[PDB]
Design a protein around this ligand. Structure first.
Ligand SMILES: [Zn+2]
Ligand SMILES: [Zn+2]
Lengths: 422, 155, 145, 48
């Protein structure tokens, strides 16, 4: 029983401990910045044991990263398993895909869940314990009674469900955030194996802040066209290589003055890697890093090749990358302002409008803070789940029948209470 | 009780003569509260759901408003606890429903976190939500938030 | 007090050119295209520092024989095989070169690590010079908008 | 400008009907009614 009180200290304190892991990674990488080759060795313009300060801090860091995967497993794993059990129960009761439709070889995210319906603790974290008999009553008359009832279904160590628990571990290991935290801990351990690994925990300013996410979200939602623009740059630079190999390969002398044992680009791969390593990153095209036309036969064709290189790579394509970033900023801000418009011009639930609730002096604020006020529907749903089914009033048992029926008439469509009467 | 300015003095004598006079001059805090407060609060809440439902349903009447300003110190205390929604209650007019918001459910909703999950949800619905599936999104958010609260008030 | 210290020393008097910022109108409508969008601008510069640090962590640990600032190596050659000097080399040269760091470096000339070196350089060029400096410039332009 | 076009189309498909060209506050005095109006009443494919 003391384990559980110790264990509601991890889950209570996940966020602060996660931020503390990030600060400890800052301090360790800062201390790591005073390296030197001599084999690697650390000097000390500090207090007496700053190599044992790293020996303290790396151990404290691996302790804390394990400490927060414990905290995550006891804080945000019940919600993942609640969403998964919720979706499996609401796909049996109203679609019956394991009873009627049999999910395909595609979507293993659903076909893995075949190993939890057969289990005997299926609605653990879902507060709707009657899923078994409700499926038996809905389908067990046409699709056979005993078939559905058979499809559904140290001494303390042999009292837990093994199949359900293996299903739980299967859902957890396929989660994104838990896989990330396991990665974080294994890089802490490999940081004990080698102190230079510890720098890859600087990756957690991305997946750990707020405004850093609102800056990286100006790339990461506009990413398919960014990747495709880089790929199109590769193809355009390839076609320039196809020209430059086949008419121009006597201008490529990397070597000094030609008396030296001269290197050229008259292979195909080396000319192409020359273009994508030099011609794109030169700023002035490729007529920067090349022998120049000095009255040769191909001088004008060479000038046209170079200037169209400069436009169609350096001006236009790099402007497409930069304009794509800037438009990602614009679209993100347009979303964040559309939300404010649809929360200050319509109601959420009754969906009326704003000129109707303002014939009252100062009235739409009262309408979305007392009449409907979204939190009170949340509190009412918490109320109906919490009571017993016998103890409902008339309205609560009606609304409760609708909610177990999952049909959703009873929220106001376009008909607030003021509109009803006069 | 005289220092705390709340009570008129005859009622201070009433709360003195009420309690226990437990064998010297003593009285329990908790075993005088639990026997003059649980039941009291319960009845008060139910009565508030009655007076409020009369005032909200039958407005513009002098007599009920006179009686309600006669009875204000219960409706003030039970305003953080009663919530009122509007639904369509099978007579195809629109009824309103009263109920009892708890306390941990009230101080759990906004903590730093669920107050931010709510604006994440609102940002999801206006972005990609429809005419038809909107309220079924809102109840999926409701069930997830309720399970998060059922956790975070037992930690 | 800067006027008085301008009597103490006449060169101080130039810091009263700071009052075109806090003294005009259209100069404030131009500086307000930075100073209200400033937290993300600071954070983008800091993120640039962390990305350039992680490139330094790669370059120290596999690549430090390409750093010869000195002429031809016959000279008493300087390298970047300390950690701080390699990192200040990156934030002083590799960011401000325009063409990445494959500008101001010894080049791969058929070494073992030629392809790993080319990948290191081109991802340096994208993830600093194209993308992060485009984030700064797009953040300014969106502040105007 | 390209993104502004692609969003103007979404506005004129979620604020007016296509054929009768009415508006949206009229078909929403019915509970949940403009979706039925552009999926059963007119619903562009049925003219096709
Ligand atoms: Zn409403
Ligand atoms: Zn029409």
């Amino acid at each position: 029983a003391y384990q559980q009180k110790l264990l509601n200290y991890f889950a209570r304190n996940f966020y602060n401990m996660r931020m503390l892991a990030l600060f400890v990674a800052f301090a360790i990488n800062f201390i790591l910045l005073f390296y030197k080759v001599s084999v690697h060795y650390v000097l000390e313009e500090s207090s007496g044991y700053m190599e044992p300060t790293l020996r303290i801090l790396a151990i404290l860091h691996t302790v804390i990263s394990f400490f927060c995967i414990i905290g995550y497993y006891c804080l945000k794993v019940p919600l993942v398993i609640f969403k998964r059990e919720k979706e499996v129960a609401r796909k049996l009761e109203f679609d019956g895909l394991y009873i009627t439709e049999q999910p395909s070889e595609d979507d293993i995210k659903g076909q893995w869940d075949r190993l939890v319906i057969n289990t005997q603790s299926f609605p653990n974290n879902y507060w709707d314990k009657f899923v078994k008999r409700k499926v038996m009553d809905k389908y067990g008359e046409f699709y056979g009674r005993d078939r559905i009832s058979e499809l559904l279904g140290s001494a303390v160590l042999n009292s837990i469900d093994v199949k359900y628990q293996m299903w739980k571990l299967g859902v957890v290991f396929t989660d994104n955030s838990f896989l990330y935290l396991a990665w974080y801990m294994t890089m802490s351990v490999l940081g004990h194996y080698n102190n230079f690994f510890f720098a890859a925990h600087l990756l957690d300013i991305a997946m750990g802040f707020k405004t850093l996410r609102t800056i990286l979200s100006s790339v990461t939602h506009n990413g398919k066209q960014l990747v495709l623009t880089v790929g199109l740059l590769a193809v355009v630079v390839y076609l320039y290589t196809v020209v430059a190999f086949n008419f121009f390969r006597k201008f490529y002398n990397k070597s000094e003055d030609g008396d030296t044992p001269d290197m050229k680009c008259d292979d195909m791969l080396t000319c192409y890697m020359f273009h994508m390593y030099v011609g794109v990153r030169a700023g002035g095209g490729i007529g920067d890093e090349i022998e120049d036309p000095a009255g040769d036969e191909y001088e004008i064709y060479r000038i046209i090749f170079d200037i169209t290189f400069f436009f169609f790579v350096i001006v236009i394509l790099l402007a497409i990358i930069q304009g794509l970033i800037i438009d990602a900023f614009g679209e993100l801000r347009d979303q964040q302002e559309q939300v404010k418009e649809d929360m200050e011009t319509k109601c959420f639930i009754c969906g009326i409008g704003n000129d109707y609730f303002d014939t009252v002096p100062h009235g739409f604020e009262t309408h979305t803070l007392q009449e409907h006020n979204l939190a009170n529907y949340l509190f009412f749903l918490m109320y109906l789940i919490n009571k017993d089914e016998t103890e409902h009033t008339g309205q609560e048992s009606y609304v409760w029948k609708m909610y177990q029926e999952r049909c959703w008439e009873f929220f106001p469509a376009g008909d607030c209470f003021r509109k009803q009467y006069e | 009780m005289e220092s705390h300015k709340h009570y008129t003095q005859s009622e201070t004598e009433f709360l003195l003569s009420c309690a226990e006079t437990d064998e010297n001059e003593t009285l329990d805090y908790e075993e005088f509260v639990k026997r003059f407060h649980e039941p009291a609060k319960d009845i008060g809440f139910n009565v508030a759901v009655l007076l409020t439902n009369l005032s909200e349903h039958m407005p513009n009447d002098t007599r009920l408003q006179t009686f309600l300003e006669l009875a204000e110190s219960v409706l003030n205390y039970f305003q953080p606890f009663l919530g009122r929604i509007e639904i369509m209650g099978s007579a195809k007019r629109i009824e309103r429903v009263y109920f009892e918001i708890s306390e941990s459910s009230r101080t759990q909703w906004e903590k730093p976190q669920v107050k931010e999950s709510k604006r994440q949800f609102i940002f999801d619905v206006v972005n990609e939500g429809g005419e038809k599936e909107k309220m079924e999104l809102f109840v999926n958010f409701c069930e997830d938030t309720i399970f998060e609260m059922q956790l975070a008030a037992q930690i």
